[PDB]
RNA sequence: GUGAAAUUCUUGGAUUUAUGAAAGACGAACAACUGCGAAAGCAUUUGCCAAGGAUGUUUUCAUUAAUCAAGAACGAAAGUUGGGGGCUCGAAGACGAUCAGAUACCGUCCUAGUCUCAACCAUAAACGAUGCCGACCAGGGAUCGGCGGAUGUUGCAGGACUCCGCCGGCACCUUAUGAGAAAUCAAAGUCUUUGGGUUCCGGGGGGAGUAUGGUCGCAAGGCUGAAACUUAAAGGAAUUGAC
């Protein structure tokens, strides 16, 4: 707010449509207070509608990371990818099953992440029961259908496409369609994915997903 | 004097119930005979949504809303207007109002 | 259905008893039988019970007839089944 | 009077005779 | 100093009923409707003033 | 530049007592203005009232043009965690007068500290009386 | 923080915002007139270990059974002995506030405790205020587990759904022709037209679950448990007023 301090611009990655998020600040040099330093905010949450331009996906909260500052950009990565409470408080209804999966599965990029699926079990077109329950003994078969689904489409290549199957609904619906035999289960998708562990910089990787700026 | 055949509560079938915290005093209430409320709210009311309206940014960000399941104990829940008093044959009506 | 007093006990109709529980019946009978399992090839005369409660097998390929479950035994898609009575 | 600090009037009176009990032997 | 036209009354509010709860409009824009209370006697048509045009009301006050 | 908007964040934070409007940067470890409703009345019970919300509302709106903040994120929040949930009575003013003061609003969301099991509230067992 | 305030924190930066690590406790929403267990009680995932009800059975033994003095297991919370842990909350204590007074209700800081391991205690409105086993006697729909049949849809024999039936369970609704002092109860019915089996247990209200003895416990205490004296009522259900 003051005199000093710099009016950066952030930069997302090259995977979403539209690259410009929003302005950040920094002090400018004074002292021990290095702009480079001082820039690796490292969190910025966004919703996913803006940097796709569609609105029906707002639903969605995506957490980059300022991995390097550097041409007065901020050249942020992934960090991770959450829900609205909003969303998550509409979908949890009374007279109905819950069932919540979640696994700690590993890339190639060494990038350690947690993943978290939820769904819910779907009445039928003629249904006069009015709970629409399950068994334990069957949504513990569909919790681990949900983990190896999970374990199957991931330990695969660069986080690259693990975000492009992310932006969709593909281990949500993937996860839907392997349950029918057991439950309807509707309203299947990932929940959130945290990051574990990250492996390095790795000085360079992170311009291979970056325009030219 | 029985007031009622349940006893105030819907426990049937079991011995014990965690309790929850009423919302207005923090006393611990049983679960099944504590008085629970699902209320969904818009964020801005009427009177906001209006000029709530043009100020967004785009027009397709449709106004969030806001669900909470609230618990109240029996003296909270009668004092607030939650819940009446009843008379002697309509305390067996279960039906919920409208 | 006023009550029994239009029925007669001793002489109760012949299918409200195909319906009630076997022992509760006016004689009590099984709810099982015997069966005659035919594979698709030939040693088709092996007997099962209905209820089985052992995984049968056939002296050809051992063919594997039927799985024992709550009720009735499992008889696969591939083996016909005719019954054997007294 | 509550029937709860009735019976806690009591046990503090037995306790008060067993001490003076304890005191004489 | 945004005058306001007396749309609908809402019935006399208040611990003595002296307050009276109505609904109005703006004369600069006929579009807004507020809700406020006014004092002493009020009709519907009436024109009324006011200083803040700000602050809001409820229902059955 | 004029027209796409620069966007900035709103943590109003409206419990029973006071009302925090507090602007940031999208990464929330900035600050552009941050006022309570107690700093704009003389009594701390007015704190949590709507007008001290709307008071401190257009201050926030007067600080946040000077930068060029020209759009907000709202994150309206309430006390959370173990304690009550429903935001105070200021939450709605504060952000009424936000949409009254030429000020743009992007996306609303609630942000209320909610546990998955929280530590025993305060109050004893039998709550508190009166 | 409060109806309102103060005790307390704070320009050494309180409150607030973002990131990250650690610690202990707790398992929201889903969660129900739903499930399991002898009761107390039991709610994140996964693996292991033994156990259990119900259902199905043209499997087996053949009265092996029901209830039970003595004698035993288990038994919320608080409490006791030590070791660990010690987030939050919080008996005792202190302070602020209200008040004629406030050792209380309202605020804040907190000790034992709240969590866990190895031992003790043996009590609760431990309640369905309703001991267990067996037979019969109205109807109805819903629901949970298993099984039998029919049925025609699923981005999929079987699973999900629909319809009928049987056994077992938690309950619910209507009505006595039943019972009851009544509230009410489908069992609290089949009772002067009194008898299916068996265990415990009450004899007007106090004194009193007190005294003492016995006995278990480290203690707090538990089990067993009177008498003198006093009293004409105490009490249950419903009714009309008054408040
Ligand atoms: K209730
Ligand atoms: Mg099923
Ligand atoms: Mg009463
Ligand atoms: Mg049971
Ligand atoms: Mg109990
Ligand atoms: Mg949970
Ligand atoms: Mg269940
Ligand atoms: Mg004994
Ligand atoms: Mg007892
Ligand atoms: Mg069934
Ligand atoms: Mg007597």
Redesign the pocket.
Request: with cysteine.
């Given at each position: 707010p003051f005199t000093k301090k710099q009016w950066y611009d952030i930069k997302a990655p090259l995977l979403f449509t539209s690259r410009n998020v929003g302005k950040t600040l920094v002090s400018r040099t004074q002292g021990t207070k290095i702009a480079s330093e001082g820039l690796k905010?490292?969190?910025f949450?966004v919703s996913l509608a803006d940097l796709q331009n569609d609105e029906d996906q707002a639903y969605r909260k995506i957490?980059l990371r300022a991995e390097d500052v550097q041409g007065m950009n901020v050249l942020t990565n992934f960090?991770?990818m959450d829900f609205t409470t909003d969303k998550?408080?509409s979908?949890?209804?009374?007279?109905?099953?819950?069932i919540?999966?979640?696994v700690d599965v590993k890339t190639t990029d060494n990038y350690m992440l947690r993943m978290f699926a939820?769904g819910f079990?779907?009445?039928?077109?003629?249904?006069?029961?009015?709970?629409?329950?399950?068994?334990?003994?069957?949504?513990?078969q569909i919790?681990?259908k949900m983990?190896e689904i999970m374990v199957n489409q991931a330990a695969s290549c660069d986080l690259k496409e693990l975000v492009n199957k992310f932006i969709p609904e593909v281990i949500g619906?993937?996860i839907?369609?392997?349950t029918?035999?057991?439950?309807?289960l509707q309203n299947v998708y990932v929940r959130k994915v945290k990051?574990?562990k990250a492996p390095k910089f790795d000085l360079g990787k992170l311009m291979e997903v970056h325009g030219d700026y | 004097?029985?007031k009622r055949?349940?006893?105030g509560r819907?426990?049937?079938?079991?011995?014990?119930?965690?309790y929850?915290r009423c919302s207005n005093?923090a006393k611990c209430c049983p679960?099944?005979k504590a008085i629970?409320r699902?209320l969904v709210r818009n964020i801005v009311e009427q009177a906001a949504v209006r000029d709530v309206q043009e100020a967004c940014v785009h027009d397709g960000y449709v106004l969030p809303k806001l669900?909470a399941?609230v618990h109240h104990c029996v003296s909270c829940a009668i004092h607030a207007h939650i819940v009446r008093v009843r008379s002697?044959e309509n305390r067996?009506n279960?039906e919920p109002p409208q | 259905?006023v009550?029994?007093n239009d029925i007669d006990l001793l002489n109760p109709p012949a299918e409200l008893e195909k319906?009630?529980?076997?022992?509760?019946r006016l004689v009590q009978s099984?709810?099982?039988?015997?069966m005659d399992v035919k594979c698709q090839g030939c040693f088709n005369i092996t007997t099962v019970?209905?209820?089985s409660?052992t995984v049968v097998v056939c002296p050809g390929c051992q063919t594997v007839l039927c799985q024992?479950?709550?009720?009735?035994a499992?008889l696969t898609?591939g083996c016909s089944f005719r019954r054997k009575?007294? | 009077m509550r029937?709860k600090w009735?019976?806690k009037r009591?046990?503090?009176?037995?306790?008060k005779?067993?001490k003076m009990?304890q005191r004489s032997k | 100093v945004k005058l306001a036209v007396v749309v609908k009354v809402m019935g006399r509010t208040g611990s003595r009923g002296q307050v009276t709860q109505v609904r109005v409009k703006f004369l600069d824009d006929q579009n807004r409707l507020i809700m406020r209370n006014v004092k002493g006697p009020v009709r519907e048509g009436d024109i009324l003033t006011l200083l803040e045009s700000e602050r809001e009301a409820r229902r059955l006050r | 530049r004029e027209g796409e908007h620069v966007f900035g964040?709103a943590?109003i934070?409206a419990?029973?007592?006071?009302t925090?409007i507090?602007v940031?940067?999208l990464?929330?470890?900035?600050?552009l203005v941050?006022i309570?409703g107690?700093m704009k009345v003389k009594?701390?019970?007015?704190?949590?009232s709507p007008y001290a919300a709307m008071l401190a509302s257009q201050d926030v709106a007067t600080r946040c043009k000077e930068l060029g903040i020209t759009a907000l994120h709202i994150?309206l929040?309430a006390?959370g965690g173990?304690?009550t949930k429903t935001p105070g009575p200021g939450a709605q003013s504060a952000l009424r007068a936000l949409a009254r003061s030429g000020m743009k609003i992007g996306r609303i969301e609630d942000?209320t500290?909610?546990?998955?099991?929280?530590?025993?509230?305060?109050?004893?067992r039998?709550?508190?009386?009166?």
């Open positions: 905010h490292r969190v949450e957490r960090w991770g998550l408080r979908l949890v209804r009374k007279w109905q099953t819950l919540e999966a979640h939820i079990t779907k009445r039928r077109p003629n249904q006069v029961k009015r709970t629409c329950y399950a068994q334990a003994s069957q949504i513990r919790r681990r983990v619906k993937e839907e369609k392997a029918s035999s057991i439950f309807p990051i574990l | 004097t029985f055949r349940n006893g819907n426990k049937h079938g079991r011995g014990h119930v965690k929850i005093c679960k099944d629970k699902f669900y399941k002697r067996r279960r | 259905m009550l029994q319906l009630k529980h076997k022992k509760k099984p709810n099982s039988f015997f019970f209905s209820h409660q024992p479950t709550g009720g009735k499992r898609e009575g007294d | 029937a009735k019976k009591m046990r503090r009176l037995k306790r005779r067993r009990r | - | 964040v943590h934070f419990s029973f007592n006071d925090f507090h940031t940067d990464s929330g470890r900035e600050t941050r309570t107690g009594a701390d019970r007015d704190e949590s994150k929040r006390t173990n304690k942000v500290p909610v546990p998955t099991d929280s530590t025993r509230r305060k109050g004893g039998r709550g508190r009386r009166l």
